[PDB]
């Protein structure tokens, strides 16, 4: 019924409160607002590295909702692991588009993902037409109701499978 919604987790989490801190509250409040709109398929992405003890370069807030959401089969750690003690981690992008581009539907982000524009042009397609940016406003979280601007669908129309 209603299109499938894929949300890129560290991307809405940078956005919100602090620019600088992942803030994890960011991503409970997007998954939210699909979820009192009758959403039921919406996976999040973030790297599992992020439920690792932070460092004080990467400082997160209510770093718990991670495994939270991951309980309830919304949040899907991507992989990552240390080598030689270094950090080393998939890219997050491709499971992102991958999986909307595959279940046709929806990518939630601020991203716009060129490089993987810049490989496969279907991709690039699919990215032009089913991105779906957003504000915060605090905790409010705002997604446009022109999603690809005044030629475009309303919102309500962008995240069905057909008006």
């Not at 560290?10 to 919100?16: E, L, T, W």
């Not at 993902?113 to 905790?139: A, C, H, P, T």
């Amino acid at each position: 019924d209603l299109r499938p919604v894929v949300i890129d987790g560290s991307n809405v989490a940078m956005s919100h409160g602090n620019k600088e801190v992942f803030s994890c509250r960011g991503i409970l409040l997007a998954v939210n607002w699909f979820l009192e709109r009758g959403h039921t398929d919406i996976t999040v992405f973030v790297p599992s590295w992020r439920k690792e003890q932070p460092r004080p370069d990467v400082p997160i807030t209510d770093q718990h909702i991670l495994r939270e959401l991951e309980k309830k089969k919304i949040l899907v750690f991507t992989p990552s692991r240390r080598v030689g003690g270094k950090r080393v981690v998939c890219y997050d992008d491709r499971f992102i588009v991958k999986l909307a581009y595959e279940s046709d539907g929806i990518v939630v982000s601020n991203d716009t993902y060129r490089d993987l524009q810049g490989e496969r042009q279907e991709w690039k397609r699919f990215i032009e037409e089913r991105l779906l940016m957003y504000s915060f406003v605090n905790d409010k979280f705002m997604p446009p109701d022109d999603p690809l601007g005044r030629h475009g669908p309303s919102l309500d129309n962008f995240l069905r499978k057909k008006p």
